[PDB]
């Protein structure tokens, strides 16, 4: 064909197929859900373990790009690490130049510009990772955003990415997250993850949950172990009775 | 010559319109203009029919971007 | 090696990629229309939300490019925001190195040259969005300009940009044939009815974005929902 | 002169999709707690026929797990079920010249 | 692109360039004993457009002007380069630039822009007029950069019939400004709808310098004369 | 919506003679709204006939007094604008417009026996304005003939 091997050429209908292949590569990966509560943002991701030989907690898709900002990953993990490093250094440059905590929308705009600049030319390929950014502060509330490799940065009350994204956002929509507090949000997110795990289509899995909000005093962090290890517990009462 | 064209229906404002209108479709223009006139139960065609009648049939919008010109 | 992939002249010099970019703009199923009144200018853009999960305040295609000029985009969103930021950069650069509010034509000309040097060379995507500016200039009144990725522009009494382009232009032309000193609420009523008869949807007030810049209020502003539904019920009976 | 009037039929509008699925909501047995507006809003670029397929496919959701009625939720997933199924389309307008 | 020689020894790229120019806007230039007239036709696509917003002629300085046939943004960026180049000539020289000098400067610029790789060569042809040392000057520049001297010429759509018509006309002794009426006739031979107040642009360079015509006298010359 | 406004129109024809024309101008947009309804083809035509008989009663009252030309010109302007203010072409062109045309021409048949040359010629030219393009227009169309006979 000769009009799909470059990121700078155009299809006759007005489309780029390199970024579409990037979208397909992203959706090949597993799922991840970001949710905005009344006070903060909760991230829930499931990761498939490939073998028991891993020492557990390897390549966790949740990263702390800022002290007050967390982020979730689906797609290709090396590009995710590069984007995480870029986000960290850009927040560093902001708070060096300006001297305060960077707004989530601003850094989302900057990483959107960065990921869209690599779509412009043909010397660099489009990225293969879609990610979510969550933050909370008292000056602006709880903020959530989602960015695809093509560069679309949209805010969400609750967003999902992955293979089971359809049923994930289906069961996101059937909850009134605007009225539930973070403790309920944890159990809801865990339940949705267990539903969309799909069991037979994959091997054994592991759960990763991350917090930002006033309960964590605005500083993003992972969930405590005591708040953990109960996801399976209220899963097993909420499993289907056949 | 076989139509109503009551008192003021202009034609020379339509002869100046470009984009190479063929010969057969003028018959179509008059025909569907009369269709428009008879749909509103009016026995005399008015000038307010012809502009929408004209834009009904030709419909060739631009097919050539202007910076190229 | 043939130019159907890279920006080179053809037999009869047809640069296929620029019409390809125009079709890429028309890929995004949205439309905007700009109408200049006697002392006002209005941009009316429709929007669609797939679900209630997304924050509707986050989706906006109207942007306050400067305090007195407004801009609106059509195409893929990321490139749209990118050239918004570039126009913002050049406007701030002009204000810093000259010291006055840049006229709309100069922003339009500079980013037209940017689009021209995009499409001039190879190894660079020639961009896939179209642009509308609305503003006020001293001793000139309201100005409405449009840019393409090819770098072309012109001056318009009123224009539109989107998928449903042509019927919008025809309706606008048959309305401006009886122009006769368009007034502010009448301009926004005509623009709303134009968008409605183009889309044939009879939109509710919470599906639209309206931006009006006026001689009376030279600062560019964004219409809120209350005055949107007030103008809708003003245009409900007529 | 040969063919006089050309008539275009477009993709159905939101009220048109509403009326079409209401027409295809003739033979249905269920408990009525359904917001048709939700299915209408989720529908975009949908054919005049695939909505009837959506009705049929929510029906086969009902026919599994022994549900004579149809729950309100089975429609929306069906919309999602048709959505990815038309992710492989060509999308050619093919306007007359 | 890195275009090179064909087995026929012909550059297909500049042939494509001149072919694209030949489909451009028709325009005409004439050199009379009191100056140079340039003229062009701009057919606005609809009434929506503003004729006064964008012009087809641009003053490089008080006495130099250039119309064109072909691409638009290419023309405006070349206007920028021509204005700037003439300006550094005035910077080094502190006298206004003669016409023929900026002619070979822009022809050179065309030569590198069709020579250097990576960049697609330009798809415009330019017509230049000026009044230097009393003798008027009118030249034509192609995309390939070969500049020609013409006292009357036509470039753009249906340019060959206009060239034949100015061969029949234009005895090159019109000491008055009647050749502008001849240019109006040449444009009217290819005018689509009518000779109106705004569709036709005319520019004059006389002993007083180059001055873009107000559309009032454009409507005046449209009236009575033809 | 239904014929209930008709008997509301009965109240509207109780006090209309007591005051001047602006009361008729103020009850006009209610009749315009009812014409704008257009429920089921000729279901709304009863309301159209009701507002037509009320405006012809006002015609009786106004032509009984000196205000003859003004009511005629205002009424012809309103019925011509009834295409645009209501649904297009008086929303049906027949059986609600037909009753309008028949009522206006019988009003002219009442007037020809009573009024002088000036009001009769203004009324007939006002009717001839409609005659040039539109009347009942089904299979008779002859009231324009029977009144141009009166003109001549």
Swiss-Prot record, chain A:
SMART domains: Proteasome_A_N. It holds the Pfam family Proteasome. PROSITE patterns: PROTEASOME_ALPHA_1, PROTEASOME_ALPHA_2. Induction: Down-regulated by antioxidants BO-653 and probucol. Up-regulated by bacterial lipopolysaccharides (LPS) and TNF. The keyword Nucleotidyltransferase does not apply. GO terms for molecular function: ubiquitin protein ligase binding. Gene3D superfamilies: Glutamine Phosphoribosylpyrophosphate, subunit 1, domain 1. It is found in: Cytoplasm; Nucleus. This is Proteasome subunit alpha type-3.
Swiss-Prot record, chain B:
It is found in: Cytoplasm; Nucleus. The modification N6-acetyllysine is found at residues 48, 52. Component of the 26S proteasome, a multiprotein complex involved in the ATP-dependent degradation of ubiquitinated proteins. This complex plays a key role in the maintenance of protein homeostasis by removing misfolded or damaged proteins, which could impair cellular functions, and by removing proteins whose functions are no longer required. Therefore, the proteasome participates in numerous cellular processes, including cell cycle progression, apoptosis, or DNA damage repair. Component of the 19S proteasome regulatory particle complex. The 26S proteasome consists of a 20S core particle (CP) and two 19S regulatory subunits (RP). The regulatory particle is made of a lid composed of 9 subunits, a base containing 6 ATPases including PSMC4 and few additional components. Interacts with NR1I3. Interacts with PAAF1. Interacts with TRIM5. Interacts with ZFAND1. Belongs to the AAA ATPase family. This is 26S proteasome regulatory subunit 6B. It comes from Homo sapiens. The gene is PSMC4. The chain holds residues 350 to 418 of 418 of the full protein.
Swiss-Prot record, chain C:
The modification N6-acetyllysine is found at residues 95, 97. One of its GO terms (biological process) is positive regulation of canonical NF-kappaB signal transduction. The modification Phosphotyrosine is found at residue 152. It comes from the Eukaryota. Keywords: Acetylation, Cytoplasm, Glycoprotein, Nucleus, Phosphoprotein, Proteasome. It is found in: Cytoplasm; Nucleus. Pfam families: Proteasome, Proteasome_A_N. One of its GO terms (cellular component) is extracellular exosome. The keyword Cytoplasm applies. Its main location: cytoplasm. The keyword Glycosyltransferase does not apply. SMART domains: Proteasome_A_N. GO terms for molecular function: endopeptidase activity; NF-kappaB binding; purine ribonucleoside triphosphate binding; RNA binding. The modification Phosphoserine is found at residues 10, 56-57. Gene3D superfamilies: Glutamine Phosphoribosylpyrophosphate, subunit 1, domain 1 (3.60.20.10). Component of the 20S core proteasome complex involved in the proteolytic degradation of most intracellular proteins. This complex plays numerous essential roles within the cell by associating with different regulatory particles. Associated with two 19S regulatory particles, forms the 26S proteasome and thus participates in the ATP-dependent degradation of ubiquitinated proteins. The 26S proteasome consists of a 20S proteasome core and two 19S regulatory subunits. The 20S proteasome core is a barrel-shaped complex made of 28 subunits that are arranged in four stacked rings. The two outer rings are each formed by seven alpha subunits, and the two inner rings are formed by seven beta subunits. The proteolytic activity is exerted by three beta-subunits PSMB5, PSMB6 and PSMB7. Interacts with ALKBH4. It comes from Homo sapiens (Human).
Swiss-Prot record, chain D:
It is found in: Cytoplasm; Nucleus. It comes from the Eukaryota. Component of the 19S proteasome regulatory particle complex. The 26S proteasome consists of a 20S core particle (CP) and two 19S regulatory subunits (RP). The regulatory particle is made of a lid composed of 9 subunits, a base containing 6 ATPases including PSMC6 and few additional components. Interacts with PAAF1. Component of the 26S proteasome, a multiprotein complex involved in the ATP-dependent degradation of ubiquitinated proteins. This complex plays a key role in the maintenance of protein homeostasis by removing misfolded or damaged proteins, which could impair cellular functions, and by removing proteins whose functions are no longer required. Therefore, the proteasome participates in numerous cellular processes, including cell cycle progression, apoptosis, or DNA damage repair. Belongs to the AAA ATPase family. This is 26S proteasome regulatory subunit 10B. It comes from Homo sapiens (Human).
